[PDB]
Write a protein that binds this DNA or RNA. Structure first.
Ligand SMILES: [Mg+2]
Ligand SMILES: [Mg+2]
Length: 807
RNA sequence: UUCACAUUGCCCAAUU
RNA sequence: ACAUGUGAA
């Protein structure tokens, strides 16, 4: 379970395409640089405050130490210099004042950039991490002070334009920046981005925006408890500033107006306090005060003397309208984004950055050219009379004149309509039934007759007794179609009951899609229905599959989904699916709740054991090979994850049978990186968005210098700029060639049963996502006693276990 | 809750 | 994910 396998070869399959990547070559000197350890007492202050401390510590202690040396700082404890500092080894206490801190500098090490060159070439097997870290600290030292750092990105108010969102928020533009080793050179990965920020405005104006006032004096009355509570929820936690210089965090909003609100000086009011001490009379005395600092003390500031501090990211969720405006502001086609990144890099002036130039680094201002190959799509085989073969074109095909490979005859089914009768009439339901049966017969999934049961219902409470009744009354019941009036808790209840309480197949459909049907929608609905009932929609043309299918092989997809920002004990959800036939088409699912924000799948061995057992029951084969697509592990966790999960896989094998030792291939799938690929030639641009065509593959130039990784953009780019999926092979007993693995991955992107399209990641990974999503629905408002309760929540019924209920 | 693609959390990141 | 867009037999 040690080091990732070396790249075995380069891919040769498919026609070439000229591409540009948002990677900008770096020239790094062949020079040793110097790494010093810093400790700033006390180390509780924000990273930025530390950065300032060091920043003018260097200014204040210029004479003795640095002497024209321009150090870079990571913001916490790491300092780097281009040539060695005068303090030969010895920790030195330094005294720094801020307009109070002791800073100790001690030598740590030498970082050789020559060793980095050696790693980029053949000579070193590994890329020296410390070196990359050093370069990264160098490159982001200045913009960490100039701009507002968010993660690996930087944001700023765009000078000359405003993009308000309302509610005191506006769009800030910026960019992601990262330093990456490559087959060719050190690369600077730069992408543009945008995010909502709080406006740097007076608090009075903030109040007006949040409470929807065109101006204050609507009214000159204290706010209603409603208004005050909304304002409270909006400003709580934000930083404000005064002029009397002072910055505070807002912990509350007083109930009383400033004229009435009092504190112990003897009881003294806030307004009067400002009159007496600060010679100020409140223009808006009827308004509340912000409570700032510790909520235990009693420090209360009037609204009209405070400003919202500049550069605070808006953490809180945006409204629907705010979001709409955000999208509208930041939407760019592929060529537009390409031009924006290029414009940004020409206007960046990285090479005049005094710290960059101090470390002798040069950055290229043009995107790297890279040659991709466009893989051929697999043929898709259908069934019926035709045995039709479909040929994807630009990552899309369709169901017209085709029947499912194996279509289910639906004989017994029901309809529960939770939409109101007056809006979703019996005529609507009838007409919808007619249409659905037409499309379904065309597809080889004949709904033989009318539903056996069709009643209206209201509220979540009616779900369980209705479903119990159905299961007890109609023998051979295959499906319940559930019509919903849009967003409702009923959906989650329908799933809790069907999936985990009764083990019944349900298909939900929104009221509006019953009222107005279209062939495309009903067709997609049929994809879902056929799968849920155990059917096989289509299969990869068998003779067109890579040689790996010549022996029994199981395809696993795995994902962990974590709770959103904020809520803190809500668990993470681990989901693993495995193929159950040779096509591969049918999948079974396993799911677990696990520790909050843990990425490592804790219970993997038990899950894989289950899947292996089910695979044997379905196919009567034991897999000689296990292909494991693992979604969403970042590089910094590669070793962590691979160590636990690979072993878990082995354990599942070992405990199942000895000496059962199938070859394992462990592939990390990453859809959330910042690598963008653009057509160099305009006539290669596909559709309105002008993206690279589906099947575009890149395994040279910008990829890893020694390891086995590649980009594959398997999908049609409909809108904006495509995200090409990245695949990183952490382990491979099966000794794949690049060609076979890339082609296999591509083909798996065509087995996804919910649409006749090639999807952005292989089917097993996608299914993993759907399973986790469904689990999250089983857990809504539910968050060993506790953990057992949550584990119970996501446990499907016995009859649901062997199904694709997640489709 | 027909579906994909894209933006986006979340892993890794980040003295009144 | 939700939310928001763009689309489809
Ligand atoms: Mg995940
Ligand atoms: Mg949506």
């Amino acid at each position: 379970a040690f080091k990732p396998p070396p790249r075995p070869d380069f891919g040769t399959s498919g026609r070439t395409i000229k591409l540009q990547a948002n990677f900008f070559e770096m020239d790094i000197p062949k020079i040793d640089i110097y790494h010093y350890e810093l400790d700033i007492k006390p180390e509780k202050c924000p990273r930025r405050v530390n950065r300032e401390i060091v920043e003018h510590m260097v200014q204040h202690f210029k004479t003795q130490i640095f002497g024209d040396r321009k150090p870079v700082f990571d913001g916490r404890k790491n300092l780097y210099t281009a040539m060695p500092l005068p303090i030969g080894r010895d920790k030195v206490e330094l005294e720094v004042t801020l307009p109070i801190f002791k800073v100790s500098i001690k030598w740590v090490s030498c970082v050789s950039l020559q060793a980095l060159h050696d790693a980029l070439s053949g000579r070193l097997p590994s890329v020296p991490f410390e070196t990359i870290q050093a370069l990264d600290v160098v490159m982001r030292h200045l913009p960490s002070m100039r701009y507002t750092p968010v993660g690996r990105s930087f944001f700023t108010a765009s000078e000359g334009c405003s993009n308000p969102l309302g509610g005191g928020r506006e769009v800030w533009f910026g960019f992601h920046q990262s330093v990456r080793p490559s087959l060719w050179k050190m690369m600077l990965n730069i992408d543009v981005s945008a995010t909502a920020f709080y406006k740097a405005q007076p608090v009075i104006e903030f109040v007006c925006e949040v409470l929807d006032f065109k101006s204050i004096e609507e009214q000159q009355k204290p706010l209603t408890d409603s208004q005050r509570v909304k304002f409270t929820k909006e400003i709580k936690g934000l930083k404000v500033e005064i002029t009397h210089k002072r910055k505070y965090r807002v912990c509350n909003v007083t109930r009383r107006p400033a004229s009435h609100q009092t504190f112990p000086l003897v009881e003294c009011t806030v307004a009067q306090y400002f009159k007496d001490r600060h010679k100020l009379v409140l223009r808006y005395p009827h308004l509340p005060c912000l409570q700032v600092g510790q909520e235990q003390k009693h420090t209360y500031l009037p609204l009209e003397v405070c400003n919202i501090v500049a550069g605070q990211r808006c953490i809180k969720k945006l409204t629907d309208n705010q979001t709409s405006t955000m999208i509208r502001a930041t939407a760019r086609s592929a060529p537009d984004r390409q031009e924006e990144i290029s414009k940004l890099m020409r206007s960046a002036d990285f090479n005049t950055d005094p710290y960059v130039r101090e470390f002798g680094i040069m950055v290229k201002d043009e995107m790297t050219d890279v040659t991709g190959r466009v893989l051929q799509p697999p043929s898709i085989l259908y069934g019926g009379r035709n045995k039709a073969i479909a040929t994807p074109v630009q990552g899309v095909w369709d169901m017209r004149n085709k029947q499912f490979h194996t279509g289910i005859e639906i004989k017994v089914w029901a309809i529960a309509c939770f939409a109101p009768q007056r809006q979703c009439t019996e005529v609507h339901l009838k007409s919808f039934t007619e249409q659905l049966r037409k499309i379904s017969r065309d597809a080889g999934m004949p709904i033989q007759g009318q539903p056996c049961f069709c009643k209206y219902a209201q509220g979540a409470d009616s779900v369980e007794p209705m479903f119990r009744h159905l299961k007890n009354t109609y023998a051979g019941l295959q499906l319940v179609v559930v019509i919903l009036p849009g967003k409702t808790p009923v959906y989650a209840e329908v799933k809790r009951v069907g999936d985990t309480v009764l083990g019944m197949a349900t298909q939900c459909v929104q009221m509006k899609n019953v009222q107005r049907t279209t062939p495309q929608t009903l067709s997609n609905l049929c994809l879902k229905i056929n799968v849920k009932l155990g059917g096989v929609n289509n299969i990869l043309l068998p003779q067109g599959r890579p040689p790996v299918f010549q022996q029994p092989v199981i395809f696993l997809g795995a994902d962990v989904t974590h709770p959103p920002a904020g809520d803190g004990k809500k668990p993470s959800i681990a989901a693993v699916v495995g193929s159950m036939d040779a096509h591969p088409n049918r999948y079974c699912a396993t799911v677990r709740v696990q520790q909050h924000r843990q990425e490592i799948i804790q219970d993997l061995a038990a899950m894989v054991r289950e899947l292996l057992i089910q695979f044997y029951k379905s196919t009567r084969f034991k897999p000689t090979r296990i292909i494991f697509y693992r979604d969403g592990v970042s590089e910094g966790q590669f070793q962590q994850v691979l160590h636990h999960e690979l072993l878990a896989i082995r354990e599942a094998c070992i405990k199942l049978e000895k000496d059962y030792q199938p070859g394992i291939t462990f592939i990390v799938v990453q859809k959330r990186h910042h690598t963008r690929l653009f057509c160099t030639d305009k006539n290669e641009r596909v559709g309105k968005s002008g993206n690279i065509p589906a099947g575009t593959t890149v395994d040279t130039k910008i990829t890893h210098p020694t390891e086995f990784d590649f980009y594959l953009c398997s999908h049609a780019g409909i809108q904006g700029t495509s995200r090409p999926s990245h695949y990183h092979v952490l382990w491979d007993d099966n000794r794949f060639s690049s060609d076979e693995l890339q082609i296999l991955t591509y083909q798996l992107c065509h087995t996804y049963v919910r649409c006749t399209r090639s999807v952005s990641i292989p089917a097993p990974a996608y299914y993993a996502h759907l399973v986790a999503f469904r689990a999250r629905y089983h857990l809504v408002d539910k968050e060993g006693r506790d953990h057992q309760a949550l584990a119970k929540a996501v446990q499907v019924h016995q009859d649901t276990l062997r199904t694709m209920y997640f489709a």
